[PDB]
């Protein structure tokens, strides 16, 4: 794509001509525009015609004038608009937009706002600039390349660039006021766009929070009957749900715990009830948060968010206490499920232990029937889970590999019981491997306790992703030395096959490597030197991997295992609330309906008791 | 060498004599010089004669006067010059220089500049001091001993000591102005000398950058038609190339990304094109940087620089994006080379696996021919590489040991195929060892991916240089206890040879050491005590080496593996751009020719798109 503006490269082409006009509006001298209007009238042409624009983009002379503002003012703008009006152009020059795929919908008002020229914005608005044109090119979309997403609207651009005067002028100018309800091509409003450009750094979060609160307070004046935070985009997300999905923890916490006093009190989501010393009791708005409603904040955080700080969101209030009462309500069902799986696995172990050769027989047949029925039940449950987690399936197993393991165990159980009916001998390794998987699957339920559940998070770490990368080097070492030892030992004056030599070389890592002078071999010295070289290289490699893993993991970073265990409990709770595949529970709504003021402002509120001695001592 | 000045040691000798004159010019009283001119006229002698100088160095009385400045002024200087003029000396005393090998070319103007006496500099220049005398002794060269390299010229001395007034006076005095184009004995100009004295500390870098920019701006006035940064020294290096070779990262980054506005705009190498929010688009000068030109900055960084921060240079713009587009253009050739090596190694493994005893036979002969041809091809390619990397060969394999390994593998392959024609049995261990090396050489191509290529940098570290130092102690332990166990076990009431006992003692480190009461030996108690002592000493040594290696490597230093992987990709790209030994590619020039102003200032410019949200938010 060509540059937006370039002092060194002339515009593409893919008497008053285009080059003279562009040079005049670049210099900014209005008196050199004389004769342009007469030339346009003589040739019956307009400034919006393709001959007077950049060929590749459709960038006009007015955008060239705004792109060359000197101290916020270009004197060629108003005479250019006067010439455009006097030429009888049915398409206004202020509303002309670029046509290329990279800068599609880009207009001069966007350039005037981005150049922070309030005078130019006023001059464009006074002459009929549409304040709802959407810059929807690839440069203005959100992706990993060179781009600037701010929404697509001029008001969203003015908000995302921290321009209070431009926002105030656009919202209530008498010519054409901008609407806070206006949406971009994705359905995003200005609050959605502020959530989009939000980062978790303190300065960006402060800017986004200030802009969000100010725009909400002005929406309380300009459109008081409009719920600005209840507007959903094309994904069905509100700004709170969008902040939950994108991992924008700071603005999510600010919206979730928002409190105002006096005026703008209906804009609050947190309402202080009473205080007594270090005890503070508050009411929290549960709208769009409680899992009783479809597509809630909790469901989005658990199953739709990809961000690494999902575990930091679930420990914020009121989410923490709400998930705590849900877990206290469902802990008996959790341990009943654990007891059922223990019974199933015990019968599995008894049946697999007493297999026959390739009253007791009837009991073994009954146990085989029970194993088949339990495998069918688990298979149907896992298939229902993966059907419900349809669209976000890649997000489903990135932290829930036990779902994959349970599905695989049930599939192996059903396959082994099918192969037993066909009387093939391969049912027994399948049954044994499903028994292995079933006993490994019992470690899912360690998350029911704090002591085991936190520890199961502390043990597993980034070792798994580096194990494969070390294994890539180690397998090359193993295969090369194995084929070498097989080739060299074929002549007599140990290593008969590739698998045997590979096993003997793998024995060195477990402390059982045989290292001897193979006197019956012809090349025994070279074989011994190859073994010693392999041992030294493998030990150097193992020391390298240990020290490298030691460098990334020991860094004194504070322990986040408690919040990850809380996130695991939240996922378990939200799955347990749906019931079973054969019996669906009716959802129970949390909180109480309370009137908190006048919009009667009746909301479902959750009461949270907080004790904080240091915070209370700081205000004395 | 004697001291430059010493209040305690008298000058060497290797009526108005030398001692009285030296004491007078040390005290600084001009009225005690009476009778010196008459004595010199009577004896027909001059102050520059060997009788009036230090014997070992040739240091004169004027240098003695300047070395004893009191508050920047010595009153004996002007009468001494008057006596020198009145004596009819054909050699001026101001231009007399020291003659010893340590202080060769040292003059009084250098001492006046180093003493920061602008009055003395003006006094010397007004009386005819040559401002282009070069201090070229061993003290003024650059080496690891006691030295001060500043260039060799008075202007370079004034610049390297941060003396703006002295530089300004030397550049435009009406008596004899110094030239910015003047070069030292190495061809270094003042900008080269500033690059030479540059350090990567912030204060030294700030001083060097300020001096460099000021001298370039004054060269824009004094010699506007002279390209000061295009001057090459005797090594053919410009100041940018010299900064790239010496690892001077700060001044290299400053020169590479230099930008000026308004006046001194032709001195810029970076030209901002357009900005829109956090997006900044700039043009970068590619002169002497692009690898299309011989001896470029990229080639110097990859193959000529010895400094440890080579990987920090390649991640700077515009080098990072340029190397990225080069890699995107050559990645298919990289993986085609990988596929060819995989095919060659697979045929190697198949041929080595199916060797006979010391249609299938014809296929094995064809495979032997293919192995021989591939070995010849790889040998010729590696020989061509080491021929092209002729002068800097020691810099070539300090980070590219795979070149050595590929050459050794090809040599072993050719030697094994030669020995097979001679029908000796030793071809088979050579073939097996070349197979080992060829399978190890496949790990070169892990750098083609980020995931494997970064990890291959993270695993290897300083363990290799400490492994040899630990091995020096461990081999002494092993040999001493081995000869002990062989000597002690010779008498009966296990260890028959040195190699056997060494292997049994090495078995303890791999977890297979045999530790038993050798009841058939006569000295079984002493043998058991020797084994226990060896085990304890070896385990203490291993624990020491593990903890010592743990101390140097775990230090929370930020990971530089990504930049080292980028440097490896840069080396691969620059080698792939030359083509093959049998087919040399034509170089493709990067960037576009654009006019950036008036010197028409036409440069080859590279467009770089940068997104930086925090930097843009800081200016709002
Ligand atoms: C169809 C109508 C008949 C229903 C019969 C009652 C079924 C109870 C189901 C139950 O408790 O589930 C236990 C377990 C499910 O694991 P999970 O979803 O918690 O975790 C899933 C992975 N996250 O599932 C199992 O362990 C398999 C059940 C088979 C053994 C039953 C033994 C009963 C002993 C009293
Ligand atoms: C003389 C005219 C005939 C030329 C025939 C084509 C040769 C292709 C060369 C090639 O792709 O090089 C692969 C490799 C070189 O390694 P490198 O320089 O990337 O890395 C070097 C170390 N850094 O070299 C090899 O692997 C050896 C080539 C022998 C096997 C060819 C198999 C072909 C299968 C299609």
Please give the Cα distance from A476 to A487 (Å, whole number): 17
Calculate Rg over the CA atoms of chain B: 35
Please give the Cα distance from A576 to B176 (Å, whole number): 93
Q: Helix, strand or coil for residue A461?
A: coil
Q: Helix, strand or coil for residue A396?
A: helix
**Any idea which ligand is nearest the CA of B347?**
2
Distance from chain centroid for Cα B603? 29
Closest among B210, B538, B446, B391 to A473, alpha carbons compared: B446
Q: Which two tokens stand for residue A540?
A: 């150097």
Please give the Cα distance from A345 to A368 (Å, whole number): 12
Please give the Cα distance from B281 to A200 (Å, whole number): 26
Please give the Cα distance from B265 to B220 (Å, whole number): 10
Does residue A35 come out as left (phi exceeding 0), alpha (psi in the -120 to 50 range) or beta? left
Residue nearest to atom 13 of ligand 1 (CA): A337
Distances from the Cα of A562 to the Cαs of A253, A452, A454, A569, B405, in angstroms?
Answer: 19, 11, 6, 11, 49
Closest partner residue to B442 (CB to CB) among A476, A540, A544 is A476
Q: Which two tokens stand for residue A550?
A: 């030691």
CB atoms within 10 A of CB A346: 10
Please give the backbone phi and psi of residue A251, each rounded to the nearest 5 degrees, phi first.
-70, -30
DSSP state at residue A56? T
Angle between helices B202-222 and B164-172 (to 10 degrees): 20
Cβ atoms of B211 and B159 closer than 8 Å: yes
Q: Helix, strand or coil for residue A280?
A: strand
Cβ atoms of A190 and B601 closer than 8 Å: no
Distance from chain centroid for Cα A388? 19
Q: How far is the CA of A338 from the centre of ligand 1 (A)?
A: 8
Q: Helix, strand or coil for residue A592?
A: strand
Question: Could you tell me what percentage of chain A is helix, strand and coil, using 3-state DSSP and rounding each to the nearest 5?
Answer: 55, 5, 40
Q: Is the dihedral of CA A537, A543, A544, A546 positive or negative?
A: positive
Closest partner residue to B594 (CB to CB) among A9, A114, A488 is A9
Q: Which two tokens stand for residue A323?
A: 């998930």
Q: Which two tokens stand for residue B506?
A: 């090495």
From B104's Cα to the closest Cα of chain A, the distance in A is: 52
Helices and strands counted in chain B (H then E): 25, 4
| Residue the block writes with tokens 């193979």 | A518
Q: Which of A332, A333, A350, A377 to mutate to test the pocket of ligand 1 (most atoms within 8 A of CB)?
A: A377
Helices and strands counted in chain A (H then E): 25, 4
Which residues of chain B come before a gap where C and the next N are over 2.5 Å apart? 14, 358, 493, 599
Contact B459 A511 (CB under 8 A): no
Q: DSSP assignment of B146-207, as one string?
A: S---S-SSHHHHHHHTT-HHHHHHHHH-SS----TT---TTS--HHHHHHHT--SSHHHHHH
Q: How far is the CA of B332 from the centre of ligand 2 (A)?
A: 14
Nearest chain A alpha carbon to B549 = A547
From A457's Cα to the closest Cα of chain B, the distance in A is: 23
CB atoms within 10 A of CB A583: 7
Q: Which of B337, B383, B579 to mutate to test the pocket of ligand 2 (most atoms within 8 A of CB)?
A: B337
Cβ atoms of B308 and B247 closer than 8 Å: yes
Strand partners, B594: B603
From A514's Cα to the closest Cα of chain B, the distance in A is: 8
Nearest chain A alpha carbon to B607 = A3
Please give the Cα distance from A373 to A367 (Å, whole number): 10
- Verify whether ligand 1 is closer than 6 Å to residue A295 (CB atom): no
Contact A512 B507 (CB under 8 A): no
Contact B463 A522 (CB under 8 A): no
Q: Say which residues have a Cβ less than 8 Å from residue A486's Cβ, sequence separation at least 6.
A: A495, A496, A497, A498, A501, B353
Helix spans in A460-523 (H):
463-488, 498-506
CB atoms within 10 A of CB B538: 20
Cβ atoms of B149 and B196 closer than 8 Å: yes
Distances from the Cα of A151 to the Cαs of A129, A136, A186, A196, A201, in angstroms?
Answer: 18, 9, 9, 8, 20
| Residue the block writes with tokens 């996922």 | A571
Best of A547, A549, A555 to substitute, by most chain B Cβ atoms within 10 angstroms, is A547
Please give the backbone phi and psi of residue A266, each rounded to the nearest 5 degrees, phi first.
-65, -15
Q: Which two tokens stand for residue A605?
A: 């509120």
Please give the Cα distance from B107 to B99 (Å, whole number): 10
Contact B506 A490 (CB under 8 A): no
Peptide bond into B606 cis (omega under 30): no
Which residues of chain A come before a gap where C and the next N are over 2.5 Å apart? 14, 358, 493, 599
Q: How far is the CA of B333 from the centre of ligand 2 (A)?
A: 10
Contact B273 A6 (CB under 8 A): yes
Please give the Cα distance from B269 to B216 (Å, whole number): 13
Residue nearest to atom 30 of ligand 1 (CA): A344
Peptide bond into B22 cis (omega under 30): no
Please give the Cα distance from A131 to A107 (Å, whole number): 10
């Amino acid at each position: 794509p060509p540059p937006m503006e370039s002092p060194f490269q002339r515009e593409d082409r893919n008497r008053f001509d285009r080059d003279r006009l562009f040079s005049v509006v670049s210099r900014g001298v209005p008196e050199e525009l004389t004769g342009l209007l007469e030339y346009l009238r003589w040739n019956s042409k307009y400034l919006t015609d393709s001959a007077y624009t950049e060929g590749s983009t459709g960038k006009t002379c007015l955008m060239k004038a705004v792109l060359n503002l000197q101290d916020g003012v270009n004197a060629c703008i108003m005479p250019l608009l006067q010439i455009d009006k006097d030429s009888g152009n049915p398409k206004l020059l202020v509303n002309a937009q670029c046509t290329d795929e990279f800068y599609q919908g880009h207009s001069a008002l966007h350039i005037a706002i981005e150049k922070r020229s309030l005078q130019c914005v006023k001059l464009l608005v006074e002459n009929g600039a549409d304040v709802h044109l959407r810059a929807c090119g690839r440069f203005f979309q959100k992706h990993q390349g060179t781009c600037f997403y701010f929404g697509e609207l001029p008001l969203s651009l003015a908000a995302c660039t921290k321009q209070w005067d431009v926002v105030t002028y656009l919202l209530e100018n008498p010519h054409q006021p901008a609407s806070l309800e206006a949406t971009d091509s994705l359905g995003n409003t200005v609050l959605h766009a502020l959530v989009m450009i939000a980062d978790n750094s303190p300065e960006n979060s402060a800017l986004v929070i200030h802009m969000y609160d100010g725009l909400l307070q002005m929406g309380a004046r300009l459109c008081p009957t409009v719920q600005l935070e209840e507007i959903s985009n094309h994904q069905g997300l509100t700004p709170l749900k969008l902040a939950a999905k994108e991992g924008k923890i700071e603005i999510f916490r600010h919206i979730l715990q928002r409190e105002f006093s006096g005026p703008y009190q209906p804009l609050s989501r947190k309402f202080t009830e009473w205080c007594y010393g270090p005890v503070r009791v508050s009411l929290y708005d549960l709208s769009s948060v409680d899992s009783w409603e479809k597509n809630s904040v909790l469901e989005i955080i658990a199953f739709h968010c990809k961000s690494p700080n999902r575990h930091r969101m679930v420990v914020l209030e009121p989410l923490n206490k709400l998930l705590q009462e849900k877990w206290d309500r469902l802990v008996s069902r959790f341990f009943f499920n654990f007891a059922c799986y223990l019974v199933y696995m015990f019968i599995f172990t008894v049946v697999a232990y007493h297999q026959p050769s390739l009253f007791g027989e009837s009991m073994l047949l009954l146990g085989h029937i029970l194993i088949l029925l339990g495998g069918i039940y688990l298979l149907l449950g896992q298939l229902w889970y993966f059907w419900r987690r349809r669209l976000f399936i890649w997000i489903s197993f990135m932290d829930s590999y036990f779902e994959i393991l349970f599905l695989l165990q049930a599939l192996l159980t059903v396959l082994s019981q099918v192969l037993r009916f066909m009387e093939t001998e391969w049912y027994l390794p399948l049954l044994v491997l499903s028994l292995v998987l079933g006993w490994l699957n019992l470690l899912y339920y360690t998350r029911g306790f704090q002591h085991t559940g936190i520890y199961s998070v502390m043990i597993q770490k980034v070792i798994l992703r580096d194990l494969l990368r070390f294994l890539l080097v180690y397998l090359v070492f193993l295969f090369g030395f194995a084929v070498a030892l097989v080739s060299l030992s074929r002549e007599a004056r140990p290593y008969r096959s590739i698998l045997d030599a590979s096993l003997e070389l793998f024995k060195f890592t477990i402390g059982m490597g045989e290292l001897a002078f193979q006197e019956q071999l012809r090349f025994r010295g070279v074989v011994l030197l190859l073994l010693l070289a392999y041992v030294l290289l493998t030990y150097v490699l193992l020391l390298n991997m240990l020290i490298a893993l030691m460098s990334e993991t020991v860094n004194h970073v504070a322990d986040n295992s408690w919040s990850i265990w809380k996130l695991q409990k939240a996922i378990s709770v939200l799955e347990m609330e749906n019931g079973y595949w054969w019996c669906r529970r009716k959802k129970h709504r949390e909180g109480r309906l309370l009137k908190v003021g006048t919009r009667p402002d009746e909301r479902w509120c959750f009461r949270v008791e907080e004790v904080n001695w240091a915070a209370w001592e700081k205000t004395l």
